[PDB]
Amino acid sequence: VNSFSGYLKLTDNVYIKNADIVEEAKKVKPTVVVNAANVYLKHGGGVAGALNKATNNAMQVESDDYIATNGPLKVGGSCVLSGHNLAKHCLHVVGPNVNKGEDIQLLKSAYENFNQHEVLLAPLLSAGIFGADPIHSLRVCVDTVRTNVYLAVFDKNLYDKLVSSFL
């Protein structure tokens, strides 16, 4: 039993809710919240900008030190950093950005990072400003992630479409 509430169950291990991931993280305090990161960990907008704003920019300060030490992430890659006031940990995962011409096949690699964590609160990777089709992202998620993932979908209209079209 865990503390996630109001989710629709899609599969054995994937759950979905119309929710603001920031508000969900603050209420749940999950062990892991996933950020929709870019390779530079520049958290300017979308999910990343919202999450970073909720940390009062502490996420960005920590991220800048990470990049100065380690250099950029790979598209499809990830790193574990602090969850600040939102979660114990933040798993920063880089899905391909269609608006930069990155290969959508890397979306599966991105979701594979979730399998290193038993339970996660996450957005749909490569959705929103990353330009991928969220219906496709959900399909890849269900077909790749084996651990327990709680998906927060900000847009109610999109949430209803994801549920109604789910095979």
Ligand SMILES: O=C(O)C[C@@H]1CN(c2ncnc3[nH]c4cc(F)ccc4c23)C[C@H](CO)O1
């Ligand atoms: O679909 C859309 O219209 C945009 C969404 C945005 N993003 C989010 N996901 C879940 N929680 C979110 N809280 C936010 C607060 C913000 F200020 C900006 C974005 C989010 C956000 C990912 C999905 C992928 O499908 O796309």
